[PDB]
């Protein structure tokens, strides 16, 4: 029943992100938390490099627009400053 889960903002597969697969599976009985799961470590590396790509692409987009705008202002000033002599 994954189309319902897409309607609810959940993962389409219940083994995807969420509380069944991202909490730790077990703890010590003393209360010590376990060392982290291998798939949770790999998965948080995937989410971290994904977020790094989102930031990197967003910064290239903003720097690209601002560089275009500075090129257009320099073209307008090379239009205006030659209107004399």
């Amino acid at each position: 029943g994954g189309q319902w889960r897409l309607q609810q903002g959940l993962a389409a597969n219940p083994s995807g992100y969420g509380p069944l697969t991202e909490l730790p599976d077990w703890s010590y009985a003393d209360g010590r938390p376990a060392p982290p799961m291998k798939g949770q470590l790999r998965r948080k590396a995937e989410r971290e490099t994904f977020a790094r790509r989102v930031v990197l692409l967003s910064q290239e987009m903003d720097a690209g627009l601002q560089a275009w705008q500075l090129r257009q202002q320099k073209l307008q000033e090379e239009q205006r400053k030659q209107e004399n002599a």
């Binding site: 219940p14 509380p19 909490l23 730790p24 599976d25 703890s27 010590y28 009985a29 003393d30 060392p35």
Partner: protein, 156 residues
Amino acid sequence: GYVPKTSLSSPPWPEVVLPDPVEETRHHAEVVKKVNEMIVTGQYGRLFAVVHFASRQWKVTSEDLILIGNELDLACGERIRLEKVLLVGADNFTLLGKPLLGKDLVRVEATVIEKTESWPRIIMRFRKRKNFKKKRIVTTPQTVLRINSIEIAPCL
């Protein structure tokens, strides 16, 4: 918009009338109060938990065994609290959470007994008339867990 009662007039299923939500939430207050009384007074016998341990969902009593298919970097004999329990039942009540239960509500304990390997497991590939024949032999690691206790906590 009236239709005379023919066969295809009204649907073949009976019309169910769902209860009013105020009285039904009061009924849930009564039932949760009673089941909390059975947990406080200790009326329950032995429990079972459905716990979503790593690979799948294991139905679990106390005093039983689970064979997992990985090494868990633990010593043989160390106690484990299994979190991600997601159903807890007794003879006369259950407790199923959405999707998991509260850690302050159910405490499932289990020791590691033995960290074995599996029986040797043959992986042969063979395509006819192409001289394609590969044999591999694989033993996965395994740990066995003795679920020591399913303790339940009167927190509803």
